[PDB]
Design a protein around this ligand. Structure first.
Ligand SMILES: N#Cc1ccc(N2CCN(Cc3ccc(COc4cccc5c4CN([C@H]4CCC(=O)NC4=O)C5=O)cc3)CC2)c(F)c1
Ligand SMILES: [Zn+2]
Ligand SMILES: [Zn+2]
Lengths: 381, 26, 1132
């Protein structure tokens, strides 16, 4: 079920435009400190560091705020929305601008900006400015890194037996179930000094957890070896958390976790314990079960795209989707996928908008076999 | 020009567009 | 708000490094051993190892190498601490005092850097030009070795190779040359660099990089005339020299990989090798080739010597003796005899040094004496596994019991000349002296003819010339053995009363009133030679001959009741050779002179229960050596019982003790008895080698255990023991253990050696149905029932194949009066990653057999189990479950709790439950009995590695975490804010320096009400990987403040080896952050307050304000401090 498509245009966000003022990322923070950052309202999105955000700006005061941010530290703060409305926020992330284009178009200003997350934080207070853009008191959250669990109890003499030869070949049977067995046998050999077996220590190994997650991802859809998957557990965990089909509360729980190992364990538990989905306002459907969650993009099954009216929707690309009805013609105006034509998909029961049917425009592609859902109404069970 | 914004649904009249808008509401 | 006090009850024993060289003197050959925080210095003698110095440092020794720079008479010692504390030490002694001075010291850590994953490497130039250190990946640290480098300043050299396996300096090089083996994506290569100092960069190596075996690990440098380096891998040992290159692949080294090595010859012609499973090789080099004077290597023969302990480190002592140091088993001394070959083994074990590490689990039991507990640990791994039983003091094994209503004194007697066996014990009361006769175990009383039946005898001892001298209260009336008639009787001419009696084998120096007359024991006569009078009342008399002669005492010191002073005077005279006035107020109780192992001493026991140790000079006079220890709380009578081929002294008092010398310093033991007032050695025929201890209530005879403060008994199992628990109703221990069984080429598994699980009395195999390649090794987990008396494995239950026994509990449940063994296991398969199913199995040991009353299958891995008010509280995967035991002998679920953490650790204190995981995510529960559901009282999540937990109290929680630290959490239910009642405040930090595996409640001292109790509350022990036993007990706020002030004052006085600050070491250390210790009092530092001199003891205390119960007392004294620290030392 493979189609000759270049999985770089959905990430490139070519639907907005091409003549974009490319900006290089050179922002950071002093780690675990108090800061003040302006917040752009009217955004309902839990954002993870490394996740791409496409934004459309309409109100003049928001345009002024983003322009001042550009002539400043070009980082705003995406707030974390819980179930309770009215800015019931306790966490958030900092988004960095790398993508600025104004274009007053019909004489407005419509700043089109694309940003990604860089750091996490917690809001201490939400100060409201009379201008219309609230600047909140921000405490930057450090990202903890932990050493190997065998470093403390390791035997000094058998430390030379700790550099294993590089992994043999790739994606080959018995090149993993034996190499990893030997790796566990030789790495956590000092577990005999403690009260816990080797497999328990491998349950907390950063490398082993990433290997398990990679196996599960390949079970979902074929990933091209090291298909842009970072070797660092930090970025790997962040990417996995970004691509998982989970609701807002699960995303904020993954965001508050401060250690990569705990994040990887939580993600592996989530995708080994959640199989059935549903849509809000029904709580009665199971459209698009896990075993068919494809990924027709570099970033993964889930990504962020924006309509021509500022509204941002995160979509889930799946192979098949039943229990749906169609309204409207297969338009090709502002489809986020250049080689596809979009159609409005309505829920067959609650008639609350979930999904978009897609059709064919070319030859070497999948004709009318495509679906992109939304997190507007999508929860796991 | 009758077209929804929360969704993207397109219409040739206004009654169904308003029905869609109020269905989005709530 | 924690106020905890932590102290060490047993120092670490595992060896992590050892060297030899001329450290103490240029002529002596020393063996230096690093245990952990301790450095041990020996002298290699013909007999064996002679201890010289025992010194502990403020860190964990990671690098320890002896080097002798040009212009130095004896070798120096470089030590690197795991906190990157570098120092150079020089041994120095001045007559009798020994001090390890620090020539240079410093800290070599970097501001930013990821520590290397292959560990710390410390190497030294053979020409002593610099020290190479590999502390971080991609950086090589160089310490130039100059006389001006007192701060140990180092510079970094960028190593383009990130992964470096092993590096060592080469011999016979014009410039300092390192030759390291490193890793690439293309494989493993050996490279060599020419380290430069002026340019501060590397250079071109002597020879080119060579591709080596894909698993080459270790490098050894071959001294001249060979040169080059030998690269030892897992399959082939190769010799590289550039132009020269040889390589063999011996088949004897393919079973296990070599991890350690040692050079036996100064020219490097032979080498020693040791591997993981503990056998010893011998790499031999042939220097046959000789072209024009130069000699080059020709062959690389490899031979097998035998089998030793699992060697952490080797070192070849002189004359065929090899010290095989171990870190997970007993250290050893072996002999490389060449012509013996008893069975194909060239090694014969000479010595064996006790090693308690690692400790995996422990239980405090009262095995022998009620009230005083004992420690039984799970020590060792693989073939070195065993059990160690630890008890404090020297116990007394009673063999008789008699009723003595307050006997005022017991003295030996032999009413049979030429019999060599005592027959009657001369027991003297306040009014009568009855000589009880017991040929065997009789309770008869045969009165002596020469002894007055109605008299409080002061002395009854055998005299020469077949006579018995009995200095009774009335007078010194002698007696005879055969005729049973009083040959002589020295009545008082002035009708005075005999107050103090002290007679030797031939001399008798007694005092009546204020006058003391020295009367010799003439043959069948009582003739004196001198007389004198004392200014004050003679409180006690001590006239004992010293070593040799044994016929006349050169000196006779006495105690004055009204003066409280001791003056040395000769027996035939009265002049005071030397004067001493130790103590005061209360009159001395008993004066004694000691001669422990060619060390003449004189001990004075005051009436307040304190003993003042002091040396003596054989010729004339004596030193002072002013030091007093409160060895009890009542007046004590000091006697001498040899019983060891050494003098020894029994200090019978409210707290009995034995004063003993280990090497040359006297030490104090403890006798595990309630209270012994009077005692005497008795080598009776019916009771041989005994010690008649007559207490204040009854008389008994027993034997001394040993002359050691701590006694460790080893029970070898030849397999790894995992968990241990005690069942008193059956008087047996339950031990989980595992042996390695290798799959042979027959479809089964074969054991490597006989084990305690395959050499048991009876056995059983788990039989239930609730549910690769040849040479692979798998673990077989067994449950062993061990007898509490003979420590023989009574049973060996074998679990299901591929089943891992995780936890073990011995408890009774519900209304069933039987006690059970409950084991929770996990079925682990290599294909899967997280266990899916596991078992909870209940055993019962009755009638010498193990049965299985009930098994319960669970969907998870039962990591821990505890007993919860007669119910079972199991931890299945990431849930905690409460189980109810019915009358149907089956478990039923009673309550669950779904967490997001793996409940590895479970505790219970009343209705509280402490839950933790390996990520230090502590969580507190509470069982609501009226409603039967757990409630989360509070939470505390902080990403770290947690090793153990414990409940200090209902509001305090102790734990051990990453980088060998300790911490204490505490809940505050009194807070009125809800977001804080669900938060655990961290109120304590500490850097223990050890990796704790287990926490246990109890203590090794005898528990008594004591009325006043102790300043400390509770008692928690712990055992670590290095094999050390600690103790932590809570404190009061005032005591905590006073001890913190004391600790701050001691650090300004105590100078530590390496000049490492105590505040820096105890600070809570982590790879990302560091913060000072709070809420913990260092017990070792406070205990070291008694070992300092009087001037320093005065410098420590100036403004403590010790007085708390009213009063300030700005002086706060210094002997007041002794009383406080003595009580703190008495608790372990
Ligand atoms: N003040 C002021 C002011 C000034 C300027 C304004 N503008 C008016 C003119 N606009 C141009 C225009 C309108 C309409 C379209 C059609 O596309 C639409 C429309 C509506 C919703 C959605 C889509 C597509 N779509 C999804 C489908 C799935 C997918 O794959 N991708 C998507 O985008 C939607 O959900 C394209 C361009 C732009 C400027 C203004 F509105 C206010
Ligand atoms: Zn629906
Ligand atoms: Zn809509």
């Amino acid at each position: 079920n493979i189609i000759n498509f270049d999985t770089s245009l959905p990430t490139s966000h070519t639907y907005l435009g091409a003549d974009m003022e490319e900006f290089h990322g050179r922002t950071l923070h002093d780690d675990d400190s108090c800061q003040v950052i302006p917040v752009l309202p009217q955004v309902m999105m839990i954002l993870i560091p490394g996740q791409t955000l496409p934004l459309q700006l309409f109100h003049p005061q928001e345009v002024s705020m983003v322009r001042n941010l550009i002539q400043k530290d070009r980082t705003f703060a995406v707030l974390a929305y819980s179930n309770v409305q009215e800015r019931e926020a306790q966490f958030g992330t900092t988004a960095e601008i790398y993508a600025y284009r104004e274009e007053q178009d019909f004489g407005i200003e419509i700043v089109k900006v694309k940003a990604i997350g860089r750091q996490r934080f917690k809001v201490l207070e939400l100060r409201t400015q009379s201008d219309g853009i609230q600047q909140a008191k921000v405490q930057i959250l450090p990202e903890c890194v932990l050493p190997s669990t065998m470093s403390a109890v390791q035997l000094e003499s058998l430390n030379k037996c700790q550099i294993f030869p590089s992994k043999p070949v790739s994606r080959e049977d018995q090149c993993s179930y034996k190499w990893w067995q030997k790796y566990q046998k030789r790495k956590f050999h000092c577990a005999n000094l403690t009260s816990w077996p080797r497999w328990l220590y491998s349950l907390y190994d950063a490398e082993t957890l990433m290997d398990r997650i990679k196996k599960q991802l390949r079970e979902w859809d074929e990933n091209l070896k090291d298909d842009s998957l970072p070797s660092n557990p930090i970025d790997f965990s962040y990417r996995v958390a970004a691509c998982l089909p989970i609701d807002d509360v699960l995303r904020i729980q993954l965001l508050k976790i401060g250690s990569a190992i705990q994040r990887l364990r939580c993600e592996l538990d989530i995708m080994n314990k959640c199989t059935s989905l549903c849509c809000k306002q029904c709580q009665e459907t199971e459209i698009t079960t896990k075993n068919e969650i494809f990924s027709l993009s570099l970033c993964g099954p889930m990504a962020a795209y924006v309509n021509p009216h500022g509204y941002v929707h995160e979509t889930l690309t799946v192979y098949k989707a039943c229990n749906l009805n169609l309204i409207g013609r297969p338009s090709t105006e502002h489809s986020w996928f250049p080689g596809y034509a979009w159609t409005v998909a309505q829920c067959k029961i609650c008639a609350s908008h979930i999904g978009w049917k897609f059709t064919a425009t070319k030859k070497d592609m999948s004709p009318q076999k495509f679906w992109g859902l939304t997190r507007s109404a999508l929860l796991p069970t | 020009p009758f077209q929804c914004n929360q969704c993207g649904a397109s219409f040739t009249q206004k009654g169904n567009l308003l029905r869609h808008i109020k269905l989005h509401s709530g | 708000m924690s106020y905890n006090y932590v102290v060490t009850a047993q120092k670490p024993t595992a060896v992590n490094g050892c060297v030899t060289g001329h450290f103490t003197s240029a002529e002596d050959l020393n063996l230096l051993i690093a245990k952990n925080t301790r450095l041990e210095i020996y002298v290699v003698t013909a007999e064996g190892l002679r201890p010289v110095k025992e010194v502990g440092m403020y860190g964990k020794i990671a690098v320890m190498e002896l080097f002798r720079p040009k212009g130095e008479s004896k070798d120096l010692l470089f030590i690197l601490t795991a906190k990157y504390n570098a120092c150079i030490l020089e041994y120095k002694q001045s007559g009798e005092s020994i001090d390890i001075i620090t020539r240079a010291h410093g800290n070599v850590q970097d501001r930013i850097g990821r520590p290397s994953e292959t560990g710390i490497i410390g190497i030294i130039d053979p020409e002593c030009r610099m020290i190479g250190l590999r502390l971080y990946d991609g950086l090589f640290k160089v310490i130039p070795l100059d006389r001006d480098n007192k701060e140990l300043k180092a510079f970094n050299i960028r190593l383009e190779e990130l992964h470096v396996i092993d590096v060592k300096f080469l011999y016979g090089c014009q410039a300092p040359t390192i030759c390291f083996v490193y890793q690439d994506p293309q494989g493993r290569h050996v490279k060599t660099y020419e380290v430069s100092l002026r340019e501060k960069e590397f250079n071109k190596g002597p020879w080119k990089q060579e591709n080596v075996e894909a698993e080459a690990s270790m490098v050894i440098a071959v001294p001249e005339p060979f040169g080059g380096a030998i690269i030892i891998g897992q399959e082939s040992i190769t010799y590289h020299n550039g132009d020269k290159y040889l390589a063999i692949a011996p088949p004897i080294i393919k079973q296990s990989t070599i991890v350690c090595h040692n050079r036996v010859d100064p020219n490097g012609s032979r080498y020693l090798l040791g591997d993981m499973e503990g056998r010893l090789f011998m790499l031999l080099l042939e220097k046959e080739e000789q072209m024009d004077g130069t000699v080059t290597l020709k062959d690389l023969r490899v031979e097998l010597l035998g089998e030793t302990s699992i060697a952490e480190c080797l070192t070849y002592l002189d004359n065929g003796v090899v010290f095989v140091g171990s870190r997970l088993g007993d250290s050893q001394l072996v002999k490389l005899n060449v012509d013996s070959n008893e069975q194909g083994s060239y090694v014969v074990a000479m010595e064996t040094f006790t090693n308690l590490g690692p400790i995996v689990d422990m239980c405090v039991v009262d095995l022998e004496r009620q009230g005083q507990g004992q420690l039984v640990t799970c020590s060792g791994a693989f073939k070195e596994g065993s059990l160690r039983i630890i008890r404090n003091g020297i116990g007394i094994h009673e063999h008789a019991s008699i009723d003595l209503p307050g006997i005022k004194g017991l003295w030996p007697l032999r009413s049979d000349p030429n019999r060599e066996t005592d027959d009657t014990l001369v027991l003297s009361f306040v009014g009568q002296t009855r000589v009880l006769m017991l040929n065997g175990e009789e309770v008869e009383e045969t009165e002596l003819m020469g002894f007055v039946d109605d008299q409080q005898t002061f002395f009854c001892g055998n005299v020469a010339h077949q006579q018995l001298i009995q200095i009774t209260s009335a007078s010194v009336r002698l007696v005879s053995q055969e005729p049973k008639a009083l040959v002589s009787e020295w009545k008082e001419p002035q009708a005075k009363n005999i107050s103090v009696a002290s007679c030797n084998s031939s001399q008798v120096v007694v005092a009546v009133g204020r006058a003391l007359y020295y009367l010799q024991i003439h043959p069948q006569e009582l003739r004196q030679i001198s007389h004198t009078e004392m200014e004050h009342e003679v409180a006690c008399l001590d006239i004992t001959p010293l070593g040799d002669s044994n016929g006349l005492s050169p000196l006779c010191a006495i105690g004055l009741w009204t003066d409280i002073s001791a003056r040395i005077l000769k027996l035939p005279s009265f002049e005071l050779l030397h004067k001493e006035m130790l103590g005061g107020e209360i009159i001395p109780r008993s004066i004694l002179m000691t001669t422990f192992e060619s060390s003449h001493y004189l001990l004075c026991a005051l009436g307040d229960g304190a003993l003042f140790y002091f040396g003596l000079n054989i010729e004339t006079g004596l030193l002072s050596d002013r030091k007093k220890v409160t060895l009890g709380t009542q007046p004590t009578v000091l006697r001498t019982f040899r019983s060891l081929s050494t003098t020894n002294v029994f200090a019978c008092s409210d707290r009995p003790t034995v004063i003993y010398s280990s090497n040359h310093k006297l030490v104090f033991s403890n006798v595990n008895l309630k209270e012994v007032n009077y005692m005497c050695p008795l080598n009776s025929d019916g009771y041989p080698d005994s010690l008649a201890l007559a207490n204040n209530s009854t008389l008994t005879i027993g034997t001394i255990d040993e002359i050691q403060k701590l006694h460790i008994r080893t029970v070898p199992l030849y397999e790894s023991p995992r968990k241990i628990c005690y069942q008193e109703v059956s008087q047996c221990f339950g031990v989980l253990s595992s042996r390695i069984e290798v799959q042979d080429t027959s479809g089964g598994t074969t054991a490597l050696r006989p084990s305690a699980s395959t050499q048991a009395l009876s056995s059983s195999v788990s039989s239930s149905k609730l549910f690769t390649s040849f040479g692979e090794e798998v673990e077989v987990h067994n449950l062993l029932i061990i007898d509490q008396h003979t420590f023989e494995v009574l049973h060996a239950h074998q679990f299901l194949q591929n089943e891992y026994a995780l936890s073990l509990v011995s408890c009774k449940l519900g209304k069933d009066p039987n006690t059970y063994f409950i084991v929770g296991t996990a079925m682990v398969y290599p294909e899967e990653a997280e266990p899916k199913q596991g078992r909870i199995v209940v055993f019962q040991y009755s009638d010498g057999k193990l049965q299985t009353v009930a098994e319960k299958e669970v969907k998870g891995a039962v990591y821990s189990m505890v007993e919860f008010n007669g119910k079972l509280l199991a931890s299945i995967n990431s849930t905690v479950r409460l189980y109810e035991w019915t009358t149907e002998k089956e478990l039923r679920t009673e309550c669950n709790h779904y967490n997001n953490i793996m409940a590895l650790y479970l505790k219970t204190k009343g209705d509280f439950i402490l839950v933790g995981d390996l990520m230090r995510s502590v969580l507190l529960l509470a069982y609501k009995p009226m409603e039967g559901n757990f409630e989360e009282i509070a939470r505390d999540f902080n990403p770290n590695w947690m090793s153990a937990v414990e409940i200090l109290d209902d509001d305090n929680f102790l734990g051990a975490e990453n980088a060998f630290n300790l911490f204490v959490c505490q809940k505050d239910s009194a807070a009125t804010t809800d977001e804080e009642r669900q938060h655990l405040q961290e109120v304590g930090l500490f850097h223990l320096g050890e990796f704790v595996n287990v926490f246990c409640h109890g203590s090794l001292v005898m528990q008594n009400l004591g009325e006043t109790s102790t300043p400390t509350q509770g008692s928690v022990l712990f055992g670590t990987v290095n094999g050390m036993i600690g103790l932590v007990t809570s404190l009061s706020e005032s005591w905590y403040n006073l001890l913190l002030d004391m600790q701050n004052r001691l650090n300004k006085v105590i100078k530590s080896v390496g000049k490492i600050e105590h505040s820096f070491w105890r600070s809570f250390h982590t790879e990302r952050k560091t913060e000072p210790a709070t809420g913990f009092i260092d017990g070792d530092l406070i205990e070291s307050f008694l070992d300092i001199s009087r001037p320093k003891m005065q410098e420590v205390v100036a403004n403590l304000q010790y007085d708390d119960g009213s009063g300030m007392k700005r002086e706060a004294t210094a002997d007041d401090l002794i009383k406080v620290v003595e009580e703190l030392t008495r608790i372990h």
